[PDB]
């Protein structure tokens, strides 16, 4: 209700001087439209009943000039209003994207990309449409009404009180209807969204919907949603149906009273006939503008909920922040230290990770393995600071990770997440993200290390073979290998592998790892794994279960001392 205006009065500020010109152009166009009946009154007054056809044609030329001015001013108003609305949309999109860019992974997951995209483009377009409509169409009715009152005062104000009382009652009736209708419209929009959600959920898993033979429950849920939406829409239709007839009746009754009082004034000889025609045309214009403006009032609740959804994003401050007093070492080696670190979402009953105390030497391959959901997926994000430590501390080369400059840390971190993704263009373009200036020889070396050259070389385009927008056109193993190679051409101090090796063939994993230790043994490698065969070769192995460390050491010591890792190994062995 109020969020939309709190957004408009902020993000239309650069276009105040342009809204001023569109307002004055609309005022002039509307004033000419209402001036046409004025000169019509003049021609019927002193042209008719006097027999002067020269005055008839002269005032006809005057009216042609007036309508030409009206069209030029209306065209200019539409042009400038379109520019203002489009610029507002551009500014809002830029601001929303910039604010989203500063988000961490936590808030990005909280909103979700599939909804963030629409919230940054289509839910900006929905407000842009309302801004343009209210600039070019909606404000016509108030402008029409004020101009009508002014022209009534100009044209024998002795009866202008009729318009001065008629317009306020029409405004009060329409405002009452709008006030009683708008919450119903908002509820109807929310219920439409809900029924669309129900239908989408039913369509997505129709196979599993029929698998459990739960058709009656789905039918009942859909019937309930449809019925409540129907009730809300029926109330909205009632209010909207008691809307046009009220305005039409008000205008017609005011016109009848106008005829009566105009006849009374003509009897006294202080009125002329043409003014009645002018007043009737004023009323017709007011009715036309009111109908054409308040017809579009369905747009406002949709834009209101839309602006609320956008303000959800715009009002969320990022948790991650640079310390503003960052430590700036010349370089950071591959020494990773975790000391009693814990991580938990707010309000969670138990932490997702707790009491981790493992450390790695200057250059070492360390693999962390654990069961699904046992906090292993968050340790990688904690090292590179996607999230932040709630209790405990994590330090890089002896200095706390929360105090280190985050951009330098990311420049020194070569990470491939479990959320495997690629960008559009060629393989060379995606691979360029590693260094942005490497020669093709370095890229080929990267594919050789990542065991991706064996298949990419067969393509005639070579490094320039096109890829899908989301990487769908490649297989999961190929996507993981490409991400691996993108990591390889960075020469980072620490390698951060987020179960990328899980989707690869075991021989391919072994060759990738041995090539990696052939080229970058000095660089520290941290691996979170779901499969033992990628963990046996690691120098140090740490196992976490239920969000807590349950073992640490070398592989054979893990068999000898850790029952949980023994179970893992006996379940993985063929």
């Amino acid at each position: 209700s109020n969020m939309l205006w709190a957004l408009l009065r902020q993000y239309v500020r650069p276009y105040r001087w342009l809204l001023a010109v569109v307002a004055v152009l609309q005022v002039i166009s509307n004033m000419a439209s209402l001036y046409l009946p004025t000169v019509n009154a003049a021609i019927i007054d002193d042209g008719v009943a006097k027999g002067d056809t020269a005055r008839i044609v002269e005032l006809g030329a005057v009216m042609l000039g007036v309508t030409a001015l009206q069209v030029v001013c209306a065209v200019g108003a539409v042009f400038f209003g379109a520019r203002a609305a489009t610029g507002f949309g551009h500014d809002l999109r830029a601001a929303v994207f910039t604010h989203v860019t500063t988000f961490s992974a936590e808030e990005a997951g909280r909103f979700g990309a599939a909804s963030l995209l629409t919230r940054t483009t289509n839910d900006v377009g929905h407000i842009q449409q309302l801004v343009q409509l209210t600039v070019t169409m909606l404000i016509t009715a108030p402008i029409m009404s004020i101009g009508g009152i002014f022209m009534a005062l100009h044209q024998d104000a002795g009866l202008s009180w009729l318009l001065l009382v008629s317009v306020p009652v029409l405004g009060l009736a329409n405002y009452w209807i709008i006030r009683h209708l708008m919450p119903v419209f908002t509820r109807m929009q929310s219920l439409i969204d809900g029924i669309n959600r129900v239908l989408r959920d039913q369509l997505s898993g129709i196979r599993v919907i029929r698998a459990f033979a739960r058709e009656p429950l789905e039918r009942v849920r859909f019937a309930e949603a449809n019925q409540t939406l129907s009730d809300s829409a029926l109330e909205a239709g009632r209010w909207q149906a008691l809307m046009l007839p009220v305005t039409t009746l008000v205008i017609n009754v005011s016109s009848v009273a106008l005829i009566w009082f105009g006849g009374l004034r003509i009897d006294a000889g202080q009125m002329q006939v043409g003014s009645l025609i002018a007043f009737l045309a004023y009323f017709m214009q007011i009715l036309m503008a009111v109908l054409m403006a308040t017809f579009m009032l369905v747009i406002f609740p949709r834009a209101a909920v839309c602006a609320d959804r956008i303000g959800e994003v715009l009002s969320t401050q990022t948790a991650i922040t640079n310390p503003a007093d960052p430590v700036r070492p010349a370089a950071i080696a591959g020494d990773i230290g975790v000391h009693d670190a814990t991580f938990c979402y707010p309000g969670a009953d138990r932490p997702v990770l707790q009491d981790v105390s493992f450390t790695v030497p200057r250059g070492t391959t360390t693999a962390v393995v654990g069961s699904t959901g046992s906090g292993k997926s968050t340790l990688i994000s904690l090292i590179c600071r996607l999230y932040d430590v709630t209790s405990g501390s994590l330090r890089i080369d002896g200095v706390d990770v929360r105090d280190l400059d985050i951009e330098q840390l990311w420049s020194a971190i070569g990470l491939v997440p479990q959320r495997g993704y690629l960008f559009s263009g060629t393989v060379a373009e995606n691979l360029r993200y590693g260094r942005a200036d490497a020669t093709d020889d370095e890229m080929w070396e990267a594919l050789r290390v990542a065991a991706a050259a064996d298949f990419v070389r067969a393509h005639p385009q070579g490094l320039d073979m096109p890829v899908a927008q989301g990487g769908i056109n490649f297989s999961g193993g190929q996507r993981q290998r490409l991400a691996i190679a993108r990591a390889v051409i960075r020469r980072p101090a620490i390698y951060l592998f987020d179960d990328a090796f899980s989707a690869l063939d075991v021989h391919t994993d072994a060759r990738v790892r041995d090539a990696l230790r052939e080229v970058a043994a000095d660089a520290t490698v941290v691996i979170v794994s779901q499969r033992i065969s990628t963990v046996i070769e690691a120098d140090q192995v740490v196992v976490i279960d239920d969000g807590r460390v349950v073992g640490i050491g070398t592989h054979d010591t893990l068999l000898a001392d850790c029952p949980i890792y023994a179970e893992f190994a006996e379940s993985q062995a063929l």
């Binding site: 994207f97 029926l234 007839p245």
Partner: protein, 619 residues
Amino acid sequence: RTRDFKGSAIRLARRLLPQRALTLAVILLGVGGIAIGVIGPRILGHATDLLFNGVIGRELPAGLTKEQAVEAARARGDGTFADLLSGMDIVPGQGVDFGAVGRTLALALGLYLVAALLVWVQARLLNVTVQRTMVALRAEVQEKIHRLPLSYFDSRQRGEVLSRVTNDVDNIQNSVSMTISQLLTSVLTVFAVLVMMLTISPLLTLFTVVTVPASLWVTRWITRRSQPLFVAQWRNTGRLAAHLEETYSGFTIVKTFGHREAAAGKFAELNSETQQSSFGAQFFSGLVSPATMFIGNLSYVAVAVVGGLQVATGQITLGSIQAFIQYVRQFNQPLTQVAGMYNTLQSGIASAERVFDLLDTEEESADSPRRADVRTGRVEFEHVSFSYVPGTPVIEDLSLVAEPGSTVAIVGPTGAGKTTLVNLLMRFYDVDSGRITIDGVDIASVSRESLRASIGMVLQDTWLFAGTIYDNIAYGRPDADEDEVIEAATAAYVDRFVHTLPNGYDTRVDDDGGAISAGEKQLITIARAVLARPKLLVLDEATSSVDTRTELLIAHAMAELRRDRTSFIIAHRLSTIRDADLILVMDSGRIIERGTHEELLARHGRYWEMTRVHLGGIK
């Protein structure tokens, strides 16, 4: 684009028809209200006639004849004036006769009240009818969706049926409700105003009707000019959406590696381009209304001047011209909306034809209420040769036998046909040649509600609706008790991670902040399958995203410990399958070999080969 206009409109009108007399009454009330709303201004013009007659007759000397007054005016000149005096009912020296004006205005006011009441009642009835027919359409679409065979959802595109079933009915609502009211009232209004105008004068009527060709031509020309800019804006917004998808979906990768600023610059360039395109498109789109209003205003100039000069000749009275001007305005008012609502009308008609084509799709064969029951789980297959389409034999000469205590496993490379195997076992598709029997009962003569409610089946992917995790697990059996849900949940080890969420068992799994990755998604689905208490469990590679330890624990606890029920296991990891009762090796749509782990180890073949892929990966 649309392919059928007349038929789609006819069947939509038929869908609104079945109330018969109610629709007839709606049309009648609309016609009435329009007719009285048109007649009203004529009565106002008659009142203005009386006023004008009185005011111009008070000037002439009293007691003279009207013809004598005209002659006296003409004798001094003023030929146009005398021709005017000749053009109304007047007697010199007479007053304005306020009684006649009062009764005329009372009649006009009563008619206006009646017209307003009729229009309000018509709008109310039409709204009720539209909502009723829309509830009927939604119920019909739901019944259709629950009656379609799975072949449609398989053959249809991913993003097509959702917009066909969800957005199309919304377009149906925003089409029928808007047009059948506004278009009908506007057409009736323009026709009634036209016939009234012709009753008043045809020479002015021509000047008021020349607008329609001009206005329609202007609208069509502006649409033709706008089409290139519209497609440019569409393409630019598509590029912007693609770039935003790239940035948001791969947010981690762009955030890392320091490519934030490059993405920001690319977004800035795309935003400037779409700003330019949208500016042009919206300007040319909104240009239409000023142009048609200009054409109508020019018509207003024409009618005003011609009526004035013709009244100066005395061919008609002043009140007729006042009414005529009001009719000209009431004639132009609906034209602008009618010109622009054609796109909405045709969009609604196309959506209606699409929805009715969906509703005309053939349904799967009716159920046979045999009410089958399971007692031993002896699932047997014989000579099954099912294929999705006439062509490649996706399944060929397939045959197998199960055991009551068997957790038999089907293993093979991706694309072999295990998913279609379990789908056929679900009767999702018909089987050509061969027969499927369980416990000696042919499932072809068994109702699907009796069959699928007892098997229990999980896909590789996970379907989770917009409910809490608790409802998601309880969907397997809503009649289950509150703590039975928790027991089935802790049997599937979802409780191992659910308590780490912000709201345990109450998290909106649709709204979740990404804390539920694929493995725990599969854990939740496995818990839901457990809660249903099935006796013929099958696992279509819901085995994928979970760790092997949790894998083996769950598989043991709810397939091998539960010896009373047989099970089907599908997994790409041979470890998770080892030591199971009977193993089926299948490739190229047929079973290569079958036996136990020791047996396929002893005889070297395909199974020995994939065992030589992971551990002994001799490549």
